[PDB]
Amino acid sequence: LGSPVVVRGWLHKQKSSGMRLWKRRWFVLADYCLFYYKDSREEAVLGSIPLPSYVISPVAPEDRISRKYSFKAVHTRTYYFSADTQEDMNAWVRAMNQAAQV
CA 23 to CA 14: how far, in whole Å? 6
Nearest by Cα to 28 from 56, 47, 15: 47
**Sheet order of strands, 45-50 included:** 45-50, 33-37, 22-30, 5-14, 79-82, 70-75, 54-58
> By what technique were these coordinates determined?
X-ray
Gyration radius of the chain over CA positions = 13
23 class by beta-carbon count within 10 Å (0-12 exposed, 13-18 middle, 19+ buried): exposed
